[PDB]
Every structure is written in C-alpha cells, then in structure tokens.
Design a protein around this ligand. Structure first.
Ligand SMILES: CCCCCCCCCCCCCCCC(=O)O
Ligand SMILES: CCCCCCCCCCCCCCCC(=O)O
Ligand SMILES: [Mn+2]
Ligand SMILES: [Mn+2]
Ligand SMILES: [Mn+2]
Ligand SMILES: [Mn+2]
Ligand SMILES: [Mn+2]
Ligand SMILES: [Mn+2]
Lengths: 274, 274
C-alpha cells in the first residue's frame, strides 16, 4: 500500500505543504531597474554566480529522472511519490532563473563563458554519468554515488554555498529583491532534496557499513573540482572589484571559501558509519 | 531558453495555478460511516470500479517516466516542465485512493479479483510496454503509440468514463462525499493530461499525415479490450443489484456503455488528419 509512516512519505507531505510558491508571482520589476542602473563593470561582476546556477538547475531537472526510475523499479513507492515533488521543484527553479534573466535583459547572453573546466567536470560529466548509470545499474554502489554527486555535492555543497553567497552580497546591497525572494524559496525546496540524499545514503550504509567508506571516497573524489570551481569564481571576482566598492561590501571571499569547506564536511557528518 | 509562448509552457502554468489540491485535506469521515452502513452485498457492488482506479493510478504514476525521459532527450524543455506537474498529479491520485481505501477499511483487501483479462491486457501489458519502449525507441511511431495508449485510451476513454460513472451513481445516492471531492479534483487534473496527449499526437501528425492512420489504428487495436473490460463491469454489476435498489438508482449500464463509446470517438476527433 502506502506506508504512511515511511520517512519519504512524510517528506512528500511536507513538500506539498511547503511547495506552493510560484515563480510567475515574483515581481522582478525592481530587479530590472537595479540591473539597468549598474555600470557595465558592475554588471559583469554579478553574472558568474548566476551562470553557475541557471545551468546548474537545468542540469538537475533533466538529471533526477533516472533515480525516480531506479527506485520505482525497486518498488519504493513512497520514495517515488516524494521524487515527483523534487522534480517539480527543479522545474520551478529553472523557471525562476529564466524569468529573472529575461526581466533584466540577459536572456540571450551566453553565460557559458563563466563555466571553467572544474565546473564542466561536475555538471556536464560526473553528474549526468552517475545519474544515467542508474538506468542499467541500480546497485547500492551506483545509488550511493548518484546521491553523493547530486544531493551531497551539487545541492548540499555547491548550491547551499551559492545561496549563502547570494545573500551575503546582494541582500546587503539592497539589490535584486525578486531574485532574492526566489533564492529563499529555492533554498527551502533544497532542504528536502538534501534530506532525500541523506536518507538514501544512510539506508544503504545501514546495510553494510563498508558503503560508508565508499561515500567518503566519492565525496573526496569530487572535492578538487568543487574547490577548483570555487577558486575560479573567487579569483574572477577579485579582478572585477567595482560592484563591491560601489556598494560598500567588503566581499569576504575567504569566509565564503570556508563556508564551502564547512558545507562539504557537514554533509559527511550527516552520514553515520554505524 | 524557455519559450514562454510554447503550448506546454502554457499548460505548465495552468497546472501550477489549478494544481494546489491536497488529498490529505479531504475529510473522509463520512465516507467511513457510509461504507460501514452498507450491507455486505451493497459493499461488493461498489468495489469493482474502485479496483479499476486504484490499480490504474499506480500503473500510470510509474509509467509516465519514460515519456519525460524521451522528451528531455529530444530537448523539449517546456514539455518536461509540464510533465513534472503530470507526474506529481498522478502521485496525488494514488495517494487519494489509498487514503479512501484506508478510511473505509478495505486497505488490505486484495482488489485484484476485479481485474479481468482485458483489463490486465491494458494496464499490465499494452501500457507499460508502450511507455518503456521509449527508453530505446523514441521514433514518432513509438511516441504516438505511447500517447495513444496512455493519454487517449487509459485517461481519455477509461478514466473519463470512470469519473462519469462514479458521479452517475454515488453523487445521486448522496454517498462518499470525500471520494467524490477527490474524483472532481482528479478529473480536473486529467484534462491537462489529455491535452498533453493531443498536443503530442497532433504535432507528430502535423509532420506526416500518414501518422494519422497510425493513430486511428492503434486506437482500434485497443478498443476490444476497452469494451471487454467495460462489458465485464457491466455484467458484474447486473448480478450484484442490491446497491442500485437500496438507493433508488436505475443504474443505466446501457448509457454508460455509450458514454465509453462516445469518449473513444471523441478522442479520435480531437486529432486532425491535416
Ligand atoms: C566564493 C564562491 C562560492 C560559492 C559557490 C557557488 C555555487 C554556484 C553553483 C550553482 C549550482 C546550482 C545547482 C543546484 C541544483 C538543484 O537545485 O538541485
Ligand atoms: C459501465 C462501466 C464503464 C466505466 C469504465 C470504468 C473505468 C475504470 C478504470 C480506471 C482507470 C484509471 C486510470 C487513470 C490514469 C490517470 O489518472 O492518468
Ligand atoms: Mn534546484
Ligand atoms: Mn535540488
Ligand atoms: Mn585546476
Ligand atoms: Mn490519474
Ligand atoms: Mn492522468
Ligand atoms: Mn473477452
């Protein structure tokens, strides 16, 4: 039947209760004015972080499907019910960033230019490969790896840090209130996504504590590309300093960096070896 | 980007606006009392139609995924955004029937007994085979067949007729107000599902009017099992006449039957050869 007490059924219920926001309701009119008011140099200072996210959301909307397939095939009905909310969330995320991009005029703008090699390695290689694998290989190893790259690294490390960074910068400056409303909603959805990942990894580790070592290993395997992208954005911003100056933000890249590091280690700690 | 004018983006927007209902909010307390008040013979008279639906909703929640995969792989982003709402709708449908079944006490009850051979041929063979095919064969032929069996026959013919039948019987009788609230919501969701099917078949026919003949052919191929199930339910009810008598319903199986026939032909007519 439905196991009403199943953790993923409970997460499904919360998703319905907490998932009513609609990107079509966000007022982006002030964002349009803010963006127009920026200098050409101030404009470029913002784009790298938006590039990472818009492309990232698109990647994950296509790439969660194989997990829903694999779990369906295993008969995990409550997981599948929850995953329908996960996939619809990601749809709204793609929608929200595309609306912002249109409202402020950079819809055309090929933002690919802000994706370095480490980024592409995560979003264009490790992520799609690990998810697609599940179509032919739904072994515990395969499922742990998919949840690690997608939920623990892409969402749980990069996206979390991305949200924090957005707040740290533009919330201070009083800029882009529509986008920040969007990001708050995104960040609320993402908490459920991460919880799914934790639950999935933990139940597999609960069967064989040796999958714990596999989890840690896959996390450390990805870390170089995580930090390598983070260094490239850090670096990139330190050149284009004009938005920080104009808006009186000592943009502390060294504390962001450690927020990333903090997120990575925190995700490890949410998986228990025993 | 997102093509804001795309028909499936517009259907996605409507789904969000019109898709807020939550099965967890439905009051089933009166349904519990109604069901308990029924005689043992009256109880059995209702179950066949509920059997068809609960199993049917479960089938379609698992079975829409390959279509979302195939269209994603073709780069039809707006279709995929809409399909996230379609899949979440089906989740709530499975949820709604399981809640009703629990509330009135038939959760255990193996309702498989009311699935005859024609039913199994649709839901356990033709439907999963046609959807799963899309994982390895996303040809126009394959996509038309998937949309025909799923959207035009299962939803557009059987489910539509099932809703009508539910209303005709229990709405008259003043019974099962919770279930009927649920069914109204379901039926509103299903209109978008059918519209997706029409759009999908029509855009493929628009490229080669010879796919029109393929559409009609696949519809007629399934008709025998549609009517054969409908005859078995018709037949089945005519024996167990006690609920009709008790509640003063001349249950007109001959008009239902023609409602089914009417639905089938109506679906053909929504696809234009030209
Ligand atoms: C000092 C800079 C550190 C900040 C790191 C920036 C992270 C931006 C990358 C965006 C990835 C978004 C993917 C989210 C996927 C989802 O929504 O499930
Ligand atoms: C005289 C009897 C005719 C009535 C026909 C009864 C139809 C019951 C079958 C239920 C199928 C439900 C599947 C719906 C799938 C979806 O929700 O997309
Ligand atoms: Mn997201
Ligand atoms: Mn996410
Ligand atoms: Mn490097
Ligand atoms: Mn349904
Ligand atoms: Mn449907
Ligand atoms: Mn027969």
């Amino acid at each position: 039947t439905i196991d009403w007490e199943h953790p993923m059924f409970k997460l499904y219920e919360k998703a319905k209760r907490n998932g009513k926001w609609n990107p079509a309701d966000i007022d982006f009119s002030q964002d349009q004015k803010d963006f127009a008011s920026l200098t050409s140099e101030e404009k470029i200072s913002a784009l790298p972080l938006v590039a990472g996210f818009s492309a990232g959301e698109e990647a994950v909307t296509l790439d969660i499907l194989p997990m829903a397939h694999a779990l369906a095939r295993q008969g995990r009905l409550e997981d599948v019910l929850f995953l329908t909310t996960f996939m619809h969330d990601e749809a709204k995320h793609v929608e929200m960033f595309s609306r912002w991009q249109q409202a402020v005029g950079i819809g055309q703008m090929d933002l690919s230019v802000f994706h370095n090699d480490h980024y592409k390695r995560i979003f264009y290689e490790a992520l799609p490969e690990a998810m697609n694998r599940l179509y032919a290989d739904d072994s515990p190893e395969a499922v742990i790896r998919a949840a690690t790259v997608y939920n623990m690294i892409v969402e749980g490390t990069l996206a979390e840090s991305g949200y924090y960074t957005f707040r740290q910068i533009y919330k201070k400056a009083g800029l882009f209130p529509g986008l920040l409303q969007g990001i708050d909603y995104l960040n609320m959805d993402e908490g459920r996504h991460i919880q799914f990942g934790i639950y999935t990894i933990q139940r597999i580790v609960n069967e064989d504590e040796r999958y714990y070592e596999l989890f840690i290993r896959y996390m450390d395997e990805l870390w170089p590309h995580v930090i390598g992208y983070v260094d490239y954005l850090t670096e990139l911003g330190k050149r284009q300093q004009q938005l920080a100056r104009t808006y009186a933000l000592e943009i502390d890249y060294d504390l962001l960096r450690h927020y990333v590091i903090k997120q990575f280690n925190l995700r490890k700690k949410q998986i228990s070896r025993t």
